[model samples]
Target chain A: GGVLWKKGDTTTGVYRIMTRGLLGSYQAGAGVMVEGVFHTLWHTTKGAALMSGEGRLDPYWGSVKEDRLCYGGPWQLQHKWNGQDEVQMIVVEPGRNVKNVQTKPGVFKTPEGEIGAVTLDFPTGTSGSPIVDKNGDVIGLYGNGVIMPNGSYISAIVQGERMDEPIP
Target chain B: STDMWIERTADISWESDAEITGSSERVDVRLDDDGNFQLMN
Candidate 1:
């Protein structure tokens, strides 16, 4: 229907960011706001960025369980900056237009590089959207999307000792 | 609570062959049985 958040709507979820650097001013990527704290994709979040909103959601601890339909499993946050922050609960399962595929297990020549390609539906500024499960449990931060024949791909998670339960 | 612990539907333990990257098989001689993997080892 409509996006979840907007330019000034505080929702504590997905948010887009604009960056100006050696390349020039452009929508660099997106991030997730958890517990009022925005988390980047395990990297240094430097530079004064103007968050406008955002997701290939990648795997993390307690996310992307084995034996289950992992890639784009169950549901998704569909959080992206496709013209004014389009966030919604979209189906990532084997739907009529979303045949989920596990890219990592496919044995791509380069695991991370394999994550590239695929027209991730949302445009440039959608790299950090979170790919939650059917119950909205944060599965992985979405990195990319929109595979062939209208299907979709996904990212991964680690689950323990970091951003999840104790290791032991 | 200001802190959050994202729960999972089915907590999966490390399955060696699950999605090992590249030429590595990631098979450890351990994990013979499935448990919490904490005290089991």
Candidate 2:
């Protein structure tokens, strides 16, 4: 079952950190790092837009199921400036295998040493949720509203590029 | 109408159909004819 949003509540626990999106669903954010660059949970197109040219975003940390089955999960959290703050973040991970899901040719792998790209099969009200790997590195950001997983487009985190950019 | 309060109310609250029809949850607001808004299940 999908988790429902409670108004005026920002509690941290299993799959609980949440953020409001523009023209979209409330997404769970998390922190990730590549090299020494630090990223909080809300670090993506809409995420950067929400930041409004301020400081980095605070991650909404949570755990993610590693595979299809719900056994042996990974402990994922946002990358806060001071330290990691654990929270409830239940965003789903877009799957691996670029050839299987990449609708368009080219744009296959992510940056070297970064988590590889994955196709998004986002369910309804699942936009703005960061797609991360087992090590809690962000892979992509789910878009707002209904998006068919036909491979029309894909969003990913590229090294040396800020996920907080409006169009990254 | 005098009863109409001058407040910017949300015209649309988006969510999945499952969330809207969940029996154990609070289902708020509904649009009525004549362009009037009402709150209820």
List residue ranges in candidate 1 displaced over 4 A: A1-11, A21-25, A42-122, A144-165, B1-41
lDDT of 1 by residue, A30-126 (tens): 4444443444332212222233223122222112211111111222222222222112221122112221222222111231222112223443444
Model 1 chain A worst lDDT run, 10 consecutive residues? A65-74
Residue-level lDDT for B35 in candidate 1? 10
DockQ of 1: 0.03
lDDT of each: 0.28, 0.24
All models, DockQ values? 0.03, 0.02
**Tens-digit lDDT track for model 2 on A124-150?**
333334333333334333332111234
lDDT by residue (tens digit), candidate 2, B1-41: 11100111111111222111101111232323321213331
Q: Estimated TM-score per prediction?
A: 0.34, 0.25
Tens digits of lDDT, candidate 1, B1-41 = 11111111122112222222211111111111221111111
Candidate of highest TM-score: 1
Taking all chains together, the TM-score of candidate 1 against the true structure is 0.34
